[PDB]
């Protein structure tokens, strides 16, 4: 039983089934349209340049939505958007997207193929720390080894009136229930750990930082998960379990258990002839 984190194989294909089967994207887009404006309201006050740091930037969809809200709030102001991302593949697509968008003149990008850790250490070696007006870590803390040091570090880079935004699954989502109850019966991949908003808020309370946490409901249609032999439903099985071919490798005593739970009022809600795994997201805003 190997971790789906296999890398650029079943991972990607399973991920895709996750996107085209959940409101993951719409959920974040809804937050950027209704809450982001208020949040970035003063990050550029008194400045002739706005510095934005994207950790785990990814492909850039949401990144681009963020810039747009920042731009309408600060017409004419140059923006400097740096991106910290380890995967060349992700960087390639991010670049492609930029070259197709046309409202990006006052915006200059720079991409760095490295991890947030390499960034952290490599920046602790130079001179004094460069400050940022806005930093964001969207769905990537799962891949960080030392979360506390990471949160203390990046918070120390926040300039005057600056804000840091972080997004992970909610402590009240199905994932939370899925990991607590079956977390150890799933392949241990030291490349990623389980993290919910509960864990994050406790680490933030302990670090003594001031934050605000908003939850927003999202779902993942796992209807194909109850249709024996459904090849797509099997795909979702791999993403959830973080295991390749979960259906054909997992103890008959394991899956048999999951079936009953992936339907309970804690894991998923049922309606319209559908089963919707709870994908609630958390948006934490950390003040400088
Ligand atoms: C929920 C989730 N959501 C997103 N947007 N990306 C992910 N990579 C995960 C995920 C899936 C399985 C495990 Cl084991 C862990 Cl740590 C994280
Ligand atoms: C979707 N998934 C393959 C990989 C994401 C890694 C961003 S890692 C970082 N900045 N330490």
CSV table of N, CA and C and ligand atoms in Angstrom, one decimal, residues 5 7-8 11-12 15 54-58 84-87 90 112 114-118 137-145 191 239, ligand 2:
chain,number,residue,atom,x,y,z
A,5,UNK,N,0.8,10.0,-3.2
A,5,UNK,CA,1.8,11.1,-3.3
A,5,UNK,C,2.9,10.6,-4.2
A,7,UNK,N,3.7,11.0,-6.9
A,7,UNK,CA,4.3,12.0,-7.7
A,7,UNK,C,4.0,11.9,-9.2
A,8,UNK,N,3.5,13.0,-9.8
A,8,UNK,CA,3.2,13.1,-11.2
A,8,UNK,C,2.8,11.7,-11.9
A,11,UNK,N,-1.3,10.8,-8.9
A,11,UNK,CA,-1.6,12.0,-8.1
A,11,UNK,C,-2.4,13.0,-9.0
A,12,UNK,N,-1.7,13.5,-10.0
A,12,UNK,CA,-2.3,14.5,-10.9
A,12,UNK,C,-3.7,14.0,-11.4
A,15,UNK,N,-6.1,14.3,-8.7
A,15,UNK,CA,-6.4,15.7,-8.3
A,15,UNK,C,-7.5,16.3,-9.2
A,54,UNK,N,3.9,35.1,-2.9
A,54,UNK,CA,3.1,33.9,-3.1
A,54,UNK,C,3.9,32.6,-2.8
A,55,UNK,N,3.5,32.0,-1.7
A,55,UNK,CA,4.2,30.8,-1.3
A,55,UNK,C,3.4,29.6,-1.8
A,56,UNK,N,4.0,28.8,-2.7
A,56,UNK,CA,3.3,27.7,-3.2
A,56,UNK,C,2.3,28.2,-4.2
A,57,UNK,N,2.6,29.3,-4.8
A,57,UNK,CA,1.8,30.0,-5.7
A,57,UNK,C,1.0,29.1,-6.6
A,58,UNK,N,1.6,28.0,-7.1
A,58,UNK,CA,0.9,27.0,-8.0
A,58,UNK,C,0.8,27.5,-9.4
A,84,UNK,N,7.1,31.7,-4.8
A,84,UNK,CA,8.0,30.6,-4.3
A,84,UNK,C,7.3,29.3,-4.6
A,85,UNK,N,7.8,28.6,-5.6
A,85,UNK,CA,7.3,27.3,-6.0
A,85,UNK,C,8.3,26.3,-6.5
A,86,UNK,N,8.4,25.1,-5.9
A,86,UNK,CA,9.4,24.1,-6.2
A,86,UNK,C,9.2,23.3,-7.5
A,87,UNK,N,8.0,23.2,-8.0
A,87,UNK,CA,7.7,22.4,-9.2
A,87,UNK,C,7.7,23.2,-10.5
A,90,UNK,N,4.5,23.3,-12.4
A,90,UNK,CA,3.6,24.4,-11.9
A,90,UNK,C,4.0,25.8,-12.4
A,112,UNK,N,10.6,31.8,-8.3
A,112,UNK,CA,11.8,31.1,-7.7
A,112,UNK,C,11.5,29.6,-7.4
A,114,UNK,N,12.0,26.8,-5.6
A,114,UNK,CA,12.5,26.4,-4.3
A,114,UNK,C,11.4,26.2,-3.3
A,115,UNK,N,11.7,25.6,-2.2
A,115,UNK,CA,10.6,25.4,-1.2
A,115,UNK,C,10.6,26.6,-0.3
A,116,UNK,N,9.6,26.7,0.6
A,116,UNK,CA,9.5,27.8,1.5
A,116,UNK,C,10.6,27.7,2.5
A,117,UNK,N,11.1,26.5,2.7
A,117,UNK,CA,12.2,26.3,3.7
A,117,UNK,C,13.5,26.8,3.1
A,118,UNK,N,13.8,26.4,1.8
A,118,UNK,CA,15.0,26.9,1.2
A,118,UNK,C,14.9,28.4,1.2
A,137,UNK,N,-0.5,31.8,1.7
A,137,UNK,CA,-0.1,30.4,1.6
A,137,UNK,C,-1.4,29.6,1.4
A,138,UNK,N,-1.8,29.4,0.2
A,138,UNK,CA,-3.0,28.7,-0.2
A,138,UNK,C,-2.9,27.2,-0.4
A,139,UNK,N,-3.5,26.4,0.5
A,139,UNK,CA,-3.5,25.0,0.5
A,139,UNK,C,-2.1,24.3,0.3
A,140,UNK,N,-1.1,24.8,1.0
A,140,UNK,CA,0.2,24.2,0.9
A,140,UNK,C,0.9,23.9,2.2
A,141,UNK,N,0.3,24.2,3.4
A,141,UNK,CA,1.0,23.9,4.7
A,141,UNK,C,1.1,22.4,4.9
A,142,UNK,N,0.3,21.6,4.2
A,142,UNK,CA,0.4,20.2,4.3
A,142,UNK,C,1.8,19.7,3.9
A,143,UNK,N,2.5,20.5,3.1
A,143,UNK,CA,3.8,20.1,2.6
A,143,UNK,C,5.0,20.7,3.4
A,144,UNK,N,4.7,21.4,4.5
A,144,UNK,CA,5.8,22.0,5.3
A,144,UNK,C,6.1,21.1,6.4
A,145,UNK,N,7.4,21.0,6.7
A,145,UNK,CA,7.8,20.2,7.8
A,145,UNK,C,7.7,20.8,9.2
A,191,UNK,N,6.2,13.3,3.2
A,191,UNK,CA,6.2,14.4,2.2
A,191,UNK,C,5.1,15.4,2.5
A,239,UNK,N,-7.6,9.8,-4.0
A,239,UNK,CA,-7.3,11.2,-3.6
A,239,UNK,C,-7.6,11.3,-2.1
B,2,LIG,C1,-0.2,19.8,-5.7
B,2,LIG,N1,1.0,19.3,-5.1
B,2,LIG,C2,1.6,18.4,-6.1
B,2,LIG,C3,2.3,19.9,-4.8
B,2,LIG,C4,2.6,21.3,-4.2
B,2,LIG,C5,3.8,21.8,-3.5
B,2,LIG,C6,3.9,23.3,-3.1
B,2,LIG,S1,5.2,23.0,-1.9
B,2,LIG,C7,6.1,24.4,-1.0
B,2,LIG,N2,6.1,25.6,-1.2
B,2,LIG,N3,7.0,23.9,0.1
